Swiss-Prot record:
Record's catalysed reaction(s): GTP + H2O = GDP + phosphate + H(+)
Modified residues (5-glutamyl serotonin): Q70
Cofactor(s) demanded: Mg(2+)
Stretch of the intact protein here: 7 to 177 of 218
Family: Belongs to the small GTPase superfamily. Rab family.
Name of the protein described by the UniProt record: Ras-related protein Rab-4A
Annotated motif Switch 2, positions: 68-77
Keyword Lipoprotein: yes
Membrane topology category: Peripheral membrane protein
Lineage of origin: Eukaryota, Metazoa, Chordata, Craniata, Vertebrata
UniProt subunit comment: Interacts with SGSM1, SGSM2 and SGSM3. Interacts with RAB11FIP1, RABEP1, ZFYVE20 and RUFY1. Interacts (membrane-bound form) with NDRG1; the interaction involves NDRG1 in vesicular recycling of E-cadherin. Interacts (in GTP-bound form) with GRIPAP1 (via N-terminus). Interacts with RABEP1 and RBSN. Does not interact with HPS4. Interacts with RABEP2; this interaction may mediate VEGFR2 cell surface expression.
Residues involved in GTP binding: 21-26, 40, 42-43, 69, 124-125, 127, 155-156
Residues binding Mg(2+): S25, T43, D66
Primary location class: membrane
Domain notes: Switch 1, switch 2 and the interswitch regions are characteristic of Rab GTPases and mediate the interactions with Rab downstream effectors. The switch regions undergo conformational changes upon nucleotide binding which drives interaction with specific sets of effector proteins, with most effectors only binding to GTP-bound Rab.
Length: 175
C-alpha cells in the first residue's frame, strides 16, 4: 500500500464519533477488514484507518479517525473535526443514554468542523434486537429533523457498514 501504488481522485477526512461502547471501532474494523473485531476494548485517544472506495466511477480515499468516546479523551480528539468532510455519528440501539447524547455530539461536530459537515447517523448493534431501547421510528425522525442521513448497522454481522461510509462520501461529492 505505498503512496505510488494507490489510485484516487479525492481525499476525504472522516471521523467516527459517539458515546463510549457504541461500536465505533468495530465499525471501522468491519469497513477496513470485513471482520468483527474480537475483544474490542475502549479506544485510547484515537485510531486511524483508510480505504479507497468507488463512488459513481470516481475513486475516493477515506482517511478515517476513530475517536475515543470516553470524556477523558475529549481534549485529544478536538483536532480530528477540523477540516473533516464527513462523520459517522454512532449510537447503540440497546442503550438509550447513547441516543440521548446525540444532540451534544452533533452540536460539537458542527461547531468544530464546518457547519456543513456531512453527517450520517448510525444506529449500531441492530443485531441485538431483544435489547432494543431506541425505536427505528424515533431515530429516523430525529435524523430528518436535524438534516442527518440515517441507517441502522451491525458491526458484528457487517450489515450496512460499507453503505454508511459510501453514502456519506456520495453526499459530499454530489449535491
Ligand atoms: N452485538 C454487537 N456487539 C457490538 C457491535 N458493535 C460493537 N459491539 C461490541 O460492543 C462493545 C464496544 O465496541 P467498540 O467498537 O469497542 O466501541 P467504541 O465505540 O469503539 N468504544 P470507545 O469509544 O470507548 O472506543 C464491544 O464489546 C464490541 O464487541 C455490534 O454491531 N453488535
Ligand atoms: Mg473505540
Amino acid at each position: 500500500g505505498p503512496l505510488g501504488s494507490e489510485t484516487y481522485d479525492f481525499l476525504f477526512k472522516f471521523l467516527v464519533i459517539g458515546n463510549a461502547g457504541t461500536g465505533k471501532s468495530c465499525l471501522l474494523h468491519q469497513f477496513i477488514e470485513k471482520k468483527f473485531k474480537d475483544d474490542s476494548n475502549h479506544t485510547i485517544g484515537v485510531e486511524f484507518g483508510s480505504k479507497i472506495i468507488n463512488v459513481g466511477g470516481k475513486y475516493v480515499k477515506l482517511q478515517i479517525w476513530d475517536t475515543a468516546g470516553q470524556e477523558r479523551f475529549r481534549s485529544v480528539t478536538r483536532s480530528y473535526y477540523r477540516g473533516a468532510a464527513g462523520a459517522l455519528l454512532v449510537y447503540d440501539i440497546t442503550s438509550r443514554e447513547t441516543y440521548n447524547a446525540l444532540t451534544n455530539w452533533l452540536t460539537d461536530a458542527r461547531m468544530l468542523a464546518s457547519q456543513n459537515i456531512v453527517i450520517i447517523l448510525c444506529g449500531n448493534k441492530k443485531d441485538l434486537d431483544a435489547d432494543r431501547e431506541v425505536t427505528f421510528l424515533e431515530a429516523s425522525r430525529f435524523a430528518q429533523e436535524n438534516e442527518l442521513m440515517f441507517l441502522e448497522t451491525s458491526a458484528l454481522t457487517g450489515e450496512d457498514v460499507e453503505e454508511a461510509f459510501v453514502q456519506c462520501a456520495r453526499k459530499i461529492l454530489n449535491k
